[PDB]
């Protein structure tokens, strides 16, 4: 069969405003373009402000992952100010941010992704939908998915209570500032956090991780598509001491079958196909500029195109779990064997092709949630009730700093330059920017655009696999554009 061109705007069950356009020929996607359609311009709004304001302003980039922006911002300010965060404040920050990884992954699998595989109750917003939605689960298993969707609404809310115990409220924490964390954990509140954590752990271990493998076992074809470039980035996150060298996720790049070190000087943002002034193309974030040009011919997105030494990379749980190669959860080892016939001990034992796939990205996110449980457990044993968590540094007149972390959806950095005690430049290079960007100046596609190539569309009137692939990356176009 010949060509059909399919445009999907809005892509739903993601965060933010995305259009996807695919060219389908002979039953498969052969080309793709992703367009982020909403712009705010945080990088220019921030200029001229007290630098400390940034750690509040930047959270409003995104209300799903605000703790990630909070973290990147306070780390950038820590560096620029020379703030020496007390050890107990480092641990408290990890407890605040770590709890939102749990919230975000659970939200993503159940409340964004699960309807890709599960038919919900017969009322809006679960209907109407594609008449041939390729929903393969038995009546019993489908009902279990719905029951878990509903339970997960409570579980994700409990995760935000965990965030707020030391973070003040959520969305948009008050508890992270330059110099540490604003509230010393008390014994009583650590018990409150731990009691909630126990409930979340039980749900993750007993419901979430098992259901991803079980649903995956009914959609084994979804491990055979969505590979894209098979190239990934991790910038490091969650310091495990004050050395700056040991982190829960260590940095690294993976491309063309090879692990390599991460050098942030190799990041450049291109704009040929983005609605920004042509003269701003090719800038490292330390020299970044944000000049919107919504009428520029040929451009199709408000997302800039980040490249790592010319490479188009993806970010997120798969990227981190592939780069770091942790041991798999006990659940995963067992169900990989029983449901897939796969003998696996560590994450890379899935194999490159199955890991870098539509369903593989859901598996990676579930496994990463399990991995984060152990980190939070450790921080709950490491934190010292009553020990001070903040220093109060003076604002410098002239300074620069960069904060690197891993948001739930992938690598995040904030760069700040201070002049006359005010923000002179602030540049954000975020997770969904790495995933959902358009072509660069040489025409090389972004990671999701490339991962769409080969996606099967056997029925052009029900092209469900297009958005299923997109959703596996957990896109957040608010983050991507800012």
């Amino acid at each position: 069969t010949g060509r059909t061109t399919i445009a999907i705007d809005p892509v739903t069950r993601i965060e933010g405003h995305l259009k996807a356009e695919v060219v389908v020929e002979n039953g498969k996607v052969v080309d793709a373009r992703l367009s982020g359609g909403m712009y705010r311009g945080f990088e220019t709004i921030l200029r001229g402000r007290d630098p400390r304001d940034a750690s509040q302003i930047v959270q409003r980039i995104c209300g799903v992952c605000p703790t990630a922006h909070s973290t990147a911002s306070v780390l950038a300010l820590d560096e620029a100010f020379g703030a020496k965060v007390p050890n107990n404040g480092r641990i408290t920050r990890n407890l605040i941010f770590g709890a939102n990884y749990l919230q975000s992954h659970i939200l993503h699998f159940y409340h964004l992704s699960a309807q890709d595989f599960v038919q919900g109750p017969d009322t809006a917003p679960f209907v109407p939908r594609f008449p041939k939605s390729d929903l393969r689960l038995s009546k019993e298993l489908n009902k279990a998915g719905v029951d878990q969707y509903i339970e997960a609404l409570e579980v994700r809310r409990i995760c935000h209570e965990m965030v707020a115990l030391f973070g003040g409220r959520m969305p948009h924490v008050q508890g992270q500032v330059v110099g540490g964390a604003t509230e010393i954990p008390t014994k009583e509140k650590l018990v409150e956090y731990a009691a909630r954590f126990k409930k979340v752990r039980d749900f993750v271990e007993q419901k979430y991780v098992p259901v991803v493998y079980t649903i995956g076992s009914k959609y084994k074809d979804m491990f055979k598509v969505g590979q894209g470039f098979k190239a990934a980035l991790c910038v490091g996150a969650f310091p495990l001491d004050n050395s700056g060298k040991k982190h829960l996720f260590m940095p690294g790049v993976y491309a063309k079958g090879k692990d390599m070190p991460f050098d942030p000087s190799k990041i450049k943002e291109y704009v040929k196909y983005s609605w920004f002034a042509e003269e701003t193309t090719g800038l490292n974030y330390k020299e970044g500029k944000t000049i919107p040009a919504p009428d520029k011919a040929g451009a199709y997105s408000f997302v800039k195109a980040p490249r790592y030494d010319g490479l188009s990379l993806e970010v997120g749980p798969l990227a981190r779990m592939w780069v770091n190669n942790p041991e798999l959860s006990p659940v995963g080892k067992k169900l990989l064997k029983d449901l897939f016939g796969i003998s696996a001990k560590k994450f890379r034992d899935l194999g490159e092709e199955a890991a870098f796939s539509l369903m593989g990205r859901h598996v990676a996110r579930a496994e990463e949630t399990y991995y984060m449980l152990g980190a939070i457990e450790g921080w709950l044993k490491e934190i010292k009730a009553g020990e001070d968590t903040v220093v109060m540094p003076a604002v410098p007149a002239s300074a620069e700093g960069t904060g690197f972390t891993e948001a739930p959806r992938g690598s995040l950095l904030h760069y700040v330059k201070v002049k006359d005690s005010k923000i002179d430049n602030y540049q954000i290079v975020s997770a969904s920017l790495w995933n959902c960007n358009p072509r660069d100046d040489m025409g090389q596609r972004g990671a999701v655009e490339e991962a769409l190539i080969g996606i099967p569309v056997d029925d052009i009137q029900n092209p469900v696999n297009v958005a299923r692939l997109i959703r596996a990356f957990d896109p957040x176009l608010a983050c991507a554009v800012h």
Partner: protein
């Protein structure tokens, strides 16, 4: 009863309004969606997608003309002919936020502007912006659209402010009909369009640390929880919200206990509340 149809349109928002609503305790969000409203369009959570999702909203809007509720999150950017916020595409034409509000705004029973961006402009309209970010009520009024607007601000709002305002409006409508009930709702809005049950009282005048403020005992570090937070930048004196007793996230904390209030429900947020960390 028959749950009213709701369309949730996101302009220049961060989805924080949707997330805060997901944190509702009583009623839970599942109870809200299955028993209180019929959420017919919401891009973050709905089953369908693309032009079919847009067309579904249009069909419901036709069937329930004058009777659906339109929730607007985020500001509405008017520069560049609306191109800074495209929300969909149908029949080979892109639909900007400007277009969508002009299309659905006139036919809604009421518009609920949720969050400070939609209510007042917020961060997207702050100094250094260049998209023409516009508050919902201003956009509608500038275009001659007379539909009542209820502002439920906050960055984000507390879930109880959103759910509670919906419940208050639906109660009014049950007992007085649509026009009568909306008249009663408008009567309990302050001059900034905010329901007085949630926004009628000042944070600072009801703050547990007011004794320390009056005694001049001020914390010099964030982690000193004995003193008043004014010197650290607390904007409670200029802020109208009930956080001092409602608290956040199931009662586990609130901004003043944890750090400072940044005045997030006020029409001048953020610029009139900045710098956040000095008085």
């Amino acid at each position: 009863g028959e749950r009213p149809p709701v369309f949730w349109l996101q302009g220049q928002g961060c989805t924080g309004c949707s997330v805060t609503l997901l944190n509702s305790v009583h009623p839970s969000i599942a109870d809200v969606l299955l028993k209180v409203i019929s959420l017919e369009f919401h891009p973050t959570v709905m089953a369908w997608e693309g032009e079919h999702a847009i067309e579904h909203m249009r069909k419901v809007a036709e069937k329930f003309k004058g009777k659906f509720f339109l929730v607007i999150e985020g500001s509405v950017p008017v520069e560049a002919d609306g191109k800074y916020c495209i929300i969909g595409e149908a029949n080979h034409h892109e639909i900007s936020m400007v277009d969508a509000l002009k299309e659905f705004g006139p036919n809604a029973a009421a518009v609920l502007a949720v969050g400070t961006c939609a209510a007042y402009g917020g961060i997207p309209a702050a100094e250094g912006s260049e998209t023409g970010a516009t508050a919902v009520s201003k956009f509608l009024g500038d275009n001659g659209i007379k539909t009542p607007v209820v502002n439920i601000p906050g960055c984000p709002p507390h879930p109880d402010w959103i759910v509670g305002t919906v419940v208050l409006a639906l109660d009014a409508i049950k007992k007085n009909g649509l026009e009568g009930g909306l008249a009663e709702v408008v009567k309990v809005l302050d001059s900034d369009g905010r329901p007085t049950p949630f926004f009628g009282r000042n944070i600072h005048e009801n703050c547990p640390y007011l004794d320390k403020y009056d005694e001049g005992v001020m914390s010099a570090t964030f982690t000193d929880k004995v003193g008043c937070r004014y010197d650290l930048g607390c904007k409670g004196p200029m802020t109208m919200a009930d956080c001092f007793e409602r608290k956040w996230n199931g009662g586990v904390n609130w901004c003043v206990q944890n750090a400072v209030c940044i005045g997030c429900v006020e029409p001048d947020f953020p610029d009139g509340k900045s710098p956040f960390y000095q008085a």
